[PDB]
Amino acid sequence: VKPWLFLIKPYEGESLSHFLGRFRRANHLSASGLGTLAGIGAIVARWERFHFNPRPSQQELEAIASVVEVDAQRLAQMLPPAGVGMQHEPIRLCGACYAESPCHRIEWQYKSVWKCDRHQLKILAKCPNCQAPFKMPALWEDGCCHRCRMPFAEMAKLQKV
RNA sequence: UACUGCUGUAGUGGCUACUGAAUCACCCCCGAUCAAGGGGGAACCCUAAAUGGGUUGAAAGGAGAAGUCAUUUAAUAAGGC
Numbered sequence: 681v682k683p684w685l686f687l688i689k690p691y692e693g694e695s696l697s698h699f700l701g702r703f704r705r706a707n708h709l710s711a712s713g714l715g716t717l718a719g720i721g722a723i724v725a726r727w728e729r730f731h732f733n734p735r736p737s738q739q740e741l742e743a744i745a746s747v748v749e750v751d752a753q754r755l756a757q758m759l760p761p762a763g764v765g766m767q768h769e770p771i772r773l774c775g776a777c778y779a780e781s782p783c784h785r786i787e788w789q790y791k792s793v794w795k796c797d798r799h800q801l802k803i804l805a806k807c808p809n810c811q812a813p814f815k816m817p818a819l820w821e822d823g824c825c826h827r828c829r830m831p832f833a834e835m836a837k838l839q840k841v
Numbered sequence: 842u843a844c845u846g847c848u849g850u851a852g853u854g855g856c857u858a859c860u861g862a863a864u865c866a867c868c869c870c871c872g873a874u875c876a877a878g879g880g881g882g883a884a885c886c887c888u889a890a891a892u893g894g895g896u897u898g899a900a901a902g903g904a905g906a907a908g909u910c911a912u913u914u915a916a917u918a919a920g921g922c
């Protein structure tokens with residue numbers, strides 16, 4: 681037998697925040713706990729809210745790669761590519777893309793993205809029924825608005841075309 | 842993708858202008874303050890006594906200029922290049 685963890689395979693276009701949240705919820709860890717295990721401290725707790733004041737470094741991502749067992753390049757593929765500007769707030773979601781695959785796309789957080797290219801829908805910045813801003817992607821235990829308990833996949837037919 | 846209203850000077854701040862008091866070193870009065878001192882008293886000592894004269898709290902100085910660090914505050918940003 682060899683040391684192991686509840687590994688999670690990353691999605692396509694998922695966020696670093698959402699992937700780390702899924703990794704934590706499948707390992708019953710905590711942001712401080714994940715950081716301490718990785719060896720980088722509370723920096724992880726920062727990444728879950730997209731505060732990349734000092735962009736996630738190559739070392740700070742290799743240390744994560746050692747723990748979550750995902751290749752460092754595959755890790756960088758959930759951060760915005762070098763030079764692309766993202767908004768850490770508000771957290772934005774497309775209902776149809778969540779119904780297709782239950783994840784949060786880092787591409788939704790780009791400053792330049794307002795339309796889902798494969799759904800032709802104006803992506804959502806707040807819950808379309810109760811105007812409740814979405815939580816951090818790592819905090820999505822499941823696909824529902826916290827205040828109104830409306831499933832994320834449902835919101836697809838409330839969001840405008 | 843930004844976010845707003847539910848807000849009365851209402852609370853709390855800042856700035857300017859005119860104003861209230863002290864404007865002193867023992868006390869009081871008149872005066873200047875980019876200049877200015879003048880006068881009038883008290884107490885004590887000396888002095889028998891003479892505004893006779895004296896005393897009526899002490900210290901220290903290397904400045905200018907330019908950067909930098911630190912702390913705090915505030916605005917902005919979601920990295921910055």
Ligand SMILES: [Zn+2]
Pocket residue numbers: 774775776777778796798799
């Ligand atoms: Zn979509």
Ligand SMILES: [Zn+2]
Pocket residue numbers: 807808809810811812825826827828829830
């Ligand atoms: Zn809601």
